[PDB]
Design a protein around this nucleic acid. Sequence first.
RNA 1: GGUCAAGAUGGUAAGGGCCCACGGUGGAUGCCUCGGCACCCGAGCCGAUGAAGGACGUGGCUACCUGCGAUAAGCCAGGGG
Length: 67
Amino acid sequence: MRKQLEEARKLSPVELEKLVREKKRELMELRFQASIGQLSQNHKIRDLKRQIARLLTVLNEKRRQNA
RNA sequence: GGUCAAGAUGGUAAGGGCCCACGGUGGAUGCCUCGGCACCCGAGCCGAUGAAGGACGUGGCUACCUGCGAUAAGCCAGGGG
């Protein structure tokens, strides 16, 4: 989903902020999932981490670029 | 064929010794390397933009060895394939 890469690029302020916050939370969800479905979940976890990692890398890009 | 007397040698292993037989432990060692050694060209400074160097981490399932450090079996862009 380098496409997600794009959406990332797109957002920015309290935007990217709240977006990453929520998503991270979703990953919490995952963590709890640690003992349920799990099977197709694997990705959701590794990746999800990765993706929020993206969000982050971005905020750095964005506001650091700013100041 | 039966009795006595006289004379000389006999096989009998508990275990043991020497020789061969087939194994057992013990690794020589013959050969064999992703390991050293010696030289010679290259190369030659890192550090608070908190270094060298370690502590505690994460890899869904992971004690350890690796790599990352909480954005942690790593996210970004560019050069390779």
